[PDB]
A paper describes a structure:
Mpro is a cysteine protease that cleaves at no less than 11 sites on the replicase polyproteins. Initially, Mpro releases itself from the polyproteins through autocleavage. Then the mature Mpro forms a functional homodimer and transcleaves pp1a and pp1ab. Given its essential role in the viral life cycle and the absence of closely related homologs in the human genome, Mpro is considered an attractive target for anti-[name] drug development (12–14).
Further, we solved the structures of [name]-[name]-2 Mpro mutant ([name]) in complex with six cleavage substrates from replicase polyproteins. P6 to P3′ (from S3564 to V3572) can also be seen bound in the substrate binding pocket. The most significant movement can be observed for α46–50 and loop in each protomer, which is likely induced by nsp5|6 substrate binding. The substrate binding pocket in the complex structure is slightly expanded compared with that in the apo mutant structure. In the S1 subsite, which is the most selective subsite, Q3569 at P1 position occupies this subpocket. In our structure, the side chain of the glutamine is stabilized by three hydrogen bonds formed by the Oε1 atom of Q3569 and Nε2 atom of H163, the Nε2 atom of Q3569 and carbonyl oxygen of F140, and the Nε2 atom of Q3569 and an ordered water molecule. These three hydrogen bonds impose an absolute requirement for glutamine in the S1 subsite. The main chain carbonyl oxygen of Q3569 occupies the oxyanion hole, which is stabilized by the amide groups of G143 and C145. The S2 subsite is a deep hydrophobic pocket, which is slightly expanded to accommodate the bulky side chain of F3568 at the P2 site compared with the apo mutant structure. Due to the steric hindrance of the benzyl group of F3568 at the P2 site, Q189 moves outward to interact with the main chain at the P4 site.
Numbering used by the authors:
A (entry chain C), D (entry chain C): 1 to 9
B (entry chain A), C (entry chain A): 1 to 306
The structure:
């Protein structure tokens, strides 16, 4: 995959 | 008696957690004195993440583009700057709950507590280790970006980890509190993957000593090994080489239990070669590598159950 | 992603811990409003413990026989009384850090966080479960008496456990915050032993659901079972019977994953019958029973990794 | 054994 940044909307 | 994965009490860090918002992106920050520290990715939309130039993105922002919320209070940002992959927001108010603190960059194999936080609100506390491949096996969901890892020593909080992202294998990568990633990772949407990991040998040995202190000896044997011969076996089982410094670090546990380090190494070699055959150690059916020698000393009695 | 044994943030409880001394005996107390709660064994010498009559021992004490230290401040005791196996010391000062709180007596199989404390100073935080035999597998040393267990829900601390003693198998026994022991144990030096324990079936099922949410399905199968047939197998492996209420409680996890509860029961039956054959689940080589359905929901994403 | 009360001296 890619990566997952874990900010919020 | 008993032996548990134990975190440090998190109150000193809870009083520092805030929420930072830039545009449509929200994450956690760490408020110490009059500065808030957070991942610089707060300034990015998800499209910016494909190939960000953070210096270019940040020069486009002003102080008032940053919203910092501490509980029920808005903090006004009065300066900003970027240090590696962290943003430093100077605010008009010093956090009255700031503990004595330091920032520390840890070595692989060291452990720390993580205060998982969402929207500036702490959710839970757990213990983990910096793996040899510079990931951590954490537990983080969307919104957890900005959560910190720390150790506490005599009321001084040493912060060592700020959370940034999750890799495809479900493990986690982040930075020290000065914004330098652990490992080769970058804060960009690009192919990155954890390198092959290894087991932290000196920590497994410490946990075998914890098992003895707590009264268990089933896995011991009458043999010894040389350090060189142990490392030949360690390499075969994807364990890190044990150094003479690690041997020295295990001195106090060796002295408390009367088991020479190289004798515990002969025990571990036998466990690797034969398995556990249905038995457990400290309630685990696998060899545990997330307790350092210092963790064992801190948690176990100073009197061995003989 | 990730799944860790996670405790609640402990700061709200840290601000309540104090030290209580009576004569030569010191232990921890819990300071809420103007009352300090601690084990009534604080009034006993080790000789008193062989056959104490606590009403007789306590009538011999006055308020000034009790020394309560909160950080750097002595609190003056202005009343005392005994409630079951806890002592309540009224002090002249209300704790300004008192959180919103309740006292709750929990059922076996429920989990809670423990703030291990020595001489009124918190040492560490860990998660544990009330076992079916009403012990906990904690980690406590001399001086830990008076440490509390708790859950937190929307800033309200529900205290559920106060630590009293260690049994010969190294497991731990204590009381609710109203001083009633969990299990048949008493605060007397006499033969007491933990009864045979069992595995908490509904919690193992919850943790199998956590494994699926986090993206793992290896242990699933195409079979189902009836509740009655599952319980025949559970009884054989020293698992508690699964009730229809437990089935209902697992509804939300079942709905999130699309795996019917009775289908997860067929998976667990197969795991009990065949073992894991070298595989792990959520990093464990044993079936884990210290996460409740609520713990899983609280920690896992609400979106399953499909 | 007996039990171990875990106060301090």
């Amino acid at each position: 995959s890619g990566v997952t940044f874990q900010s919020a909307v | 008696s008993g032996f548990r994965k134990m975190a440090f009490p998190s109150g000193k860090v809870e009083g520092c957690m805030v929420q930072v918002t830039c545009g449509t992106t929200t994450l956690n920050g760490l408020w110490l004195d009059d500065v808030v520290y957070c991942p610089r990715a707060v300034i990015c939309t998800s499209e910016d993440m494909l190939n960000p130039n953070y210096e270019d993105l940040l020069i486009r922002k002003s102080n008032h583009n940053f919203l910092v919320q501490a509980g029920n209070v808005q903090l006004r940002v009065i300066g900003h700057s970027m240090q590696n992959c962290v943003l430093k927001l100077k605010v008009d108010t010093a956090n009255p709950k700031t503990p004595k603190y330091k920032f520390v960059r840890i070595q692989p194999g060291q452990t720390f507590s993580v205060l998982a936080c969402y929207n500036g609100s702490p959710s839970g506390v757990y213990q983990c280790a910096m793996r040899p491949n510079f990931t951590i096996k954490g537990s983080f969901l969307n919104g957890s970006c900005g959560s910190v890892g720390f150790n506490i020593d005599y009321d001084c909080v040493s912060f060592c980890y700020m959370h940034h992202m999750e890799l495809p294998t479900g493990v986690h990568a982040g930075t020290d509190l000065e914004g330098n990633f652990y490992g080769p990772f970058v804060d960009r949407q690009t192919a990155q993957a954890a390198g092959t990991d290894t087991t932290i040998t000196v920590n497994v040995l410490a946990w075998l000593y914890a098992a003895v202190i707590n009264g268990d000896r089933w896995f011991l044997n009458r043999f010894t090994t040389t350090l060189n011969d142990f490392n030949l076996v360690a390499m075969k089982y994807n364990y890190e080489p044990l150094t003479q410094d690690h041997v020295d670090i295990l001195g106090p546990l060796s002295a408390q239990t009367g088991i020479a380090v190289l004798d515990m190494c002969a025990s571990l070699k036998e466990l690797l070669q034969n398995g556990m055959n249905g038995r457990t150690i400290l309630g685990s059916a696998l060899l545990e590598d997330e307790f350092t020698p210092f963790d064992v000393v801190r948690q176990c009695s100073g009197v061995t159950f003989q």
